[PDB]
């Protein structure tokens, strides 16, 4: 049932009261932060490759 | 199979210029911060000297020397009963146990500010009023009862 979330992204949320953050490919609506707009699993796995600008394995 | 690892402590406190006072401050340290404990122990020593009129440092060191422990245990069972092997414990743990016993028995009163009761407990432990001296006496007596279990190797 991903098309519900997809069209809800396309269909205008009548107000800001409809709070949900998603990605155009990611189906989950949780922890898809506005800083990168992608799933936590997606983000961590692609960050093992180090492709996001300024994202490296943290060492303080 | 951990080998011997050295113990660590901190620098003395100018009220006595001894490490025992600072270690008591460390043990009684609430809010995780040593300023309150330092104030508590300073007032404790003031109330020690104003009671019975005796110098706080010798009283405190006599307390920690008469609470002095001399043992640690290694448990082992034969078939359904567990007994003890008395083992020589490093002096660091000995002084640590003495100071921790002093600290714990110092605050076991609920009548006034903690200052008077910690001073009174330090006085009692120095004057051998049984709060932790009995523990040393019992350890010395049971050192003639657990060495029997230490002798045979089951």
């Amino acid at each position: 049932a991903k098309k519900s979330l997809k069209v809800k992204q396309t269909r205008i949320p009548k107000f800001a009261v409809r709070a949900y953050t998603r990605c155009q490919r990611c189906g989950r609506a949780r922890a898809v932060l506005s800083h990168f707009g992608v799933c936590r699993l997606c983000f961590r796995e692609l960050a093992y490759a180090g492709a996001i600008p300024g994202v490296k394995k943290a060492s303080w | 199979r951990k080998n011997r690892a050295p113990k660590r402590t901190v620098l003395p406190d100018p009220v006595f210029n001894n490490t025992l006072v600072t270690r008591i401050i460390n043990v009684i340290m609430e809010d995780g911060k040593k300023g309150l404990a330092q104030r508590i122990l300073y007032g404790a020593f003031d109330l020690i000297e104003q009671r019975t009129k005796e110098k706080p440092l010798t009283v405190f060191e006599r307390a920690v020397g008469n609470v002095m422990p001399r043992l640690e245990l290694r448990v082992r069972r034969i078939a359904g009963s567990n007994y003890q092997v008395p083992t020589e414990v490093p002096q660091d743990r000995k002084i640590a146990l003495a100071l921790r016993w002093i600290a714990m028995f110092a605050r076991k009163r609920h009548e006034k500010t903690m200052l008077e009761k910690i001073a009174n407990e330090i006085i009692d432990a120095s004057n051998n009023t049984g709060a932790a001296i009995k523990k040393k006496d019992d350890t010395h007596k049971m050192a003639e009862a657990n060495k029997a279990f230490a002798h045979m190797r089951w």
Binding site: L41, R44, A58 | -
Partner: protein, 101 residues
């Protein structure tokens, strides 16, 4: 003289790229523009993020990642336009940005 005081903030997400950009700009604006200070830096705002590893279980199973940042500053009391004229010949690597504050 073009601007009474130009505040150029060099903001980047690596120390090496920011230093390279700083040296490049401070060496190319000299000779066509005067009265520019050297590599004056700013305290940074590097951050750390932590993102889980397992799909559903063990929220504690996470990997930590660094969002590094490094900043330099120039306060140009005297500015010449030619300073930017050559800036397109040694074009800045995209790891660093220049903010005109």
């Amino acid at each position: 003289v073009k601007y009474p005081e130009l505040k150029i903030k060099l903001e980047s997400y690596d120390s090496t790229l920011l230093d390279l950009t700083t040296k490049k700009i401070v060496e190319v604006v000299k000779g066509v523009d005067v009265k520019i200070k050297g590599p004056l830096p700013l305290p940074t705002k590097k951050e750390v993020i932590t993102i889980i590893r397992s799909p559903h279980v063990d929220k504690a199973s996470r990997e930590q990642f660094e969002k590094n940042r490094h900043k330099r500053l120039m306060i140009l009391v005297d500015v010449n336009q030619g300073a930017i004229d050559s800036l397109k010949r040694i074009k800045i690597p995209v790891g660093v940005t220049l903010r005109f504050s």
